[PDB]
Amino acid sequence: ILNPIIIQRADPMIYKHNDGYYYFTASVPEYDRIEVRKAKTIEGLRNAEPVDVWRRHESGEMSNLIWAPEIHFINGAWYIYFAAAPDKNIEDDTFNHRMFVIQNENENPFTGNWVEKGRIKTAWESFSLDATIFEHNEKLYYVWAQQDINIKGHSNIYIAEMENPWTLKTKPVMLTKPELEWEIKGFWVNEGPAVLKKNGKIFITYSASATDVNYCIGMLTAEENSNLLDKNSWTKSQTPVFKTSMENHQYGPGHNSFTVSEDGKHDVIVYHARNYTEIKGDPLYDPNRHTRAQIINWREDGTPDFGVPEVDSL
Template sequence: MSDYPNPLIEQRADPHIWLHNDGHYYFIASVPEYDRLEIRRSSTLTGLSDASATVVWHKPDTGPMSALIWAPELHFIDGKWVIYYAAAPSQEIVDGLFQHRMYALMCEDADPQTGKWVEKGRIRTPIDSFSLDATHFEHQGKSYYLWAQKDPAIRGNSNLYIAEMENPWTLKSPPVMLSKPELDWEIIGFWVNEGPAVIKHGDKIFITYSASATDENYCIGLLSADTGSNLLDAAAWHKSPRPVFTTNMQNRQFGPGHNSFTRNEQGEDVLVYHARNYTEIEGDPLYDPNRHTRIKTFAWDENGLPDFGVPEPDNRPLTLQKNTAQ
């Protein structure tokens, strides 16, 4: 197992690291201002800490994508770079929710930092409702889209859905709900299932996701299915009864969540996530900027399940302080 600077990158929430076939790591995340998309690149994981950030897109002043740019992910699909992100028309809350919808950008150039990005518009689902946290994965020759969305008929903020894709910005199949917030640890503060991420190991495919409010109650849950099963069959997926990665008070790591996965230079699996190192949050936790990006290697147990361990303590001084203004 490997030791890493903790935090790896300060004030970057919802982190996503893509290990590309050029041998470089590409990093994208939510910024505290929620106003832009920026990419970092490094030949090493730890090099992302000091890598310069290139802004590849900035929100417009008006329109459906003019506020609260959340949870971007960078993928390379069918020879093209794609960024998935969520955006809202304003900071207005309606029926207890922001008004986010999901969007995509596409770049056909080799270098996503210098290439031209084109807006592909909104990714539409059958229900026109709060939706966010999209990710993409391929399995047995098929392309899948996985995301969180509100169903007005189901209690809570968001459920997890999956669909096959026609192309990187168009659904091919009807969405299938895989999970909804229902267990006691998924409904603290808010009823939430969000931030899905996919990893495969052995004969299993796993979806991690985040649950509860974005404070110290935020945690990571786990769904699993056999790799040979029909991934669009909700019955093929099993939900773990307990969270698999949670707050650790002894290490002063609070609300670990919204993870992604990558591999380090040695080929080890790496969990990428954000967490705070304090609980005293003034106002809405979403506007507290100090959810820092953190990474840790993890192992697999004798049953082939991921063993994430506990969030490790900070091991380097922070330069940005609590309650830093946006």
């Protein structure tokens, strides 16, 4: 794969649909809308024309800092899960994002049939973002980042089971909080969860530390038939599974997703990183996190080896 695939797109999410095609969304640098594009191949996404399917509200809950959309197809309909804030105030050390979802029941997600389901409520109200979804044994799970005032830092990773694609039916179960030295650089953060199933296991990668050079990816692992809503089922990687490569000039890799290659043979990690280190301004407004993709290697023991972020090809 020739990297980067797409410049100036953060929190990249590629979904390979059953029409053959890959659909991509991401955080745009203006944080003001949800862009989607389609192509037959991963590298085809570079040149695919993006379409804004949804734009921030003028005021109120979905009006600011539109972050990290993911496009999913569940039970015959499209869902895009995203976060948004009512303003840019900082309260309890963080922005005040909540989580939303828009649904499109039409086969073609570019049609103008996106319905706001509203706010996906959890057991308490605080900074919440970066939701993703997975299915196991006909149950649907929601995995997301949220702050708890009684747990140190900006956000922890939670899982819950869902009643439907916009509604939880359990309390949040905390799986990781920021605490290891590589999770607490800049800010104490666990965010950007992504789920990969392979080898009788479920892997939840997540990103940690601030969104500069220190950003990196950790991982939780569970046996697929364990009790997924018990923290003790999940083993937390002691060191990052993916991090800055000083040698390759790729800095702060993170907020990954997972897809598969065109022939279906390989798993692919899709992530953002910068190719310079001295940002010299507020990182939130530096637009140069670029979207990148690499093949995942599998070890003898069934665990994934993500390697290192590869050098730019262009």
